[PDB]
Amino acid sequence: GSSGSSGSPDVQLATLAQRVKEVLPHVPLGVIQRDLAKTGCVDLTITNLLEGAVAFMPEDI
């Protein structure tokens, strides 16, 4: 049980948008953040972007 980097225990949207972005910088963060919510998996996002993969939705009055 070891880790490369010191240790950054954070899996927030940012942390995600980072990766997904790191792979696809072109795509905006605003959409990414959402696209992520549409699923919740960097890998997924990639595909979603590639094709579509859209479902679920948040709430807010």
Curated annotation (Swiss-Prot):
Tissues expressed in: Detected in blood platelets and leukocytes (at protein level). Ubiquitous. Highly expressed in placenta, liver, kidney, skeletal muscle, heart and brain.
Modified residues annotated as Phosphoserine in this record: 8
Highest taxon above the source species: Eukaryota
PTM remark: Monoubiquitinated and diubiquitinated. (Microbial infection) Not ubiquitinated following Dengue virus infection.
Coiled coil: none
Protein localization: Endoplasmic reticulum membrane; Lipid droplet; Cytoplasmic vesicle, Autophagosome
Factors inducing expression: (Microbial infection) By Dengue virus infection (at protein level).
Entry text on domains: The CUE domain is required for interaction with the ER quality control machinery and misfolded substrates, ubiquitination, lipid clustering and interaction with AMFR but is not required for localization to lipid droplets.
Function field: Plays a role in the translocation of terminally misfolded proteins from the endoplasmic reticulum lumen to the cytoplasm and their degradation by the proteasome. Plays a role in lipid droplet formation. Induces lipid droplet clustering. Recruits ubiquitin-conjugating enzyme UBE2G2 to lipid droplets which facilitates its interaction with ubiquitin ligases AMFR/gp78 and RNF139/TRC8, leading to sterol-induced ubiquitination of HMGCR and its subsequent proteasomal degradation. Also required for the degradation of INSIG1, SREBF1 and SREBF2. (Microbial infection) Following Dengue virus infection, required for induction of lipophagy which facilitates production of virus progeny particles.
Family membership noted in the UniProt record: Belongs to the AUP1 family.
Subunit structure: Identified in a complex that contains SEL1L, OS9, FAF2/UBXD8, UBE2J1/UBC6E and AUP1. Interacts with the cytoplasmic tail of ITGA2B, ITGA1, ITGA2, ITGA5, ITGAV and ITGAM. Interacts (via C-terminus) with ubiquitin-conjugating enzyme UBE2G2; the interaction recruits UBE2G2 to lipid droplets. Interacts with ubiquitin ligases AMFR/gp78 and RNF139/TRC8; this promotes interaction of UBE2G2 with AMFR and RNF139. Interacts with apolipoprotein APOB. (Microbial infection) Interacts with Dengue virus NS4A; the interaction occurs in the presence of Dengue virus NS4B and induces lipophagy which facilitates production of virus progeny.
Designated name of the protein: Lipid droplet-regulating VLDL assembly factor AUP1
This protein's encoding gene: AUP1
Whole-protein residues included: 292 to 345 of 410
